[PDB]
């Protein structure tokens with residue numbers, strides 16, 4: 236099982252904390268890595284699903300929460316907190332999906348433990364021509380009641396220039 | 397988590413964060429060690445997780461047998477294809493189709509370094525200090541050499 240992935244992710248985070256000595260730099264590297272991963276993962280996801288285009292950001296949200304999360308992490312976040320415009324939504328998860336534990340005392344206040352998921356989400360959606368911002372606004376590992384990834388549609392990526 | 401995710405993380409760590417810009421041996425060495433060390437931690441944690449029967453190996457050959465069958469199966473969903481030993485501390489673990497050489501491959505030995513650590517950390521938690529190295533013997537295979545420390 237992918238106790239493997241969480242253990243591997245955890246070792247990566249730990250290693251980055253050793254290398255950087257700045258949690259914001261760990262966060263950026265994680266995001267950067269996630270993006271790189273998401274770009275490749277969307278290819279895998281589209282081939283493994285027979286998921287077509289999403290004619291909306293609501294439809295995009297359903298795929299991400301119901302199909303994509305289920306495929307890769309074996310879970311299904313709920314979609315909450317729609318903006319009236321329909322351009323932002325939250326993904327709610329019961330726990331931090333990439334990470335079980337946190338060492339005490341907390342010497343990594345700024346660290347966004349699963350920020351890789353946010354890179355992943357943004358890279359993947361870039362490849363289906365949606366500029367997005369994904370960010371954790373709640374995390375159980377920060378003592379919040381749930382983990383919340385807020386997704387925000389920025390723009391459709393122009394064909395050509 | 398689907399193995400797709402692990403394979404992509406592994407590939408991303410090797411080709412991204414910890415690819416050497418080939419500045420020199422020191423940079424190459426450091427990049428290599430970071431991957432191997434990570435593997436070492438993961439190896440430790442896989443043992444903790446799936447092997448609290450640390451009592452029931454009771455000697456080196458059983459431990460290398462476990463690595464070859466159960467441990468490799470945990471990580472790569474199959475066993476190694478050949479275990480050879482000199483009976484003097486060296487073991488060679490052959491994987492004929494090594495799964496992490498699938499993401500051509502110039503820097504392919506970088507893709508072995510995490511797994512060398514996996515084995516080393518796995519043995520560390522089973523009581524054995526080792527140096528673990530690897531090479532691609534004939535792509536897509538792949539021998540890992542485990543030298544056990546006195």
Ligand SMILES: *C(=O)CCCCCCCCCCCCCCC
Pocket residue numbers: 276277280287288289294295298299303304307308351352355356359360363401
């Ligand atoms: C409609 O066409 C939109 C397609 C949406 C593609 C969804 C791909 C996102 C994959 C991310 C799922 C999280 C698992 C990754 C964990 C690091």
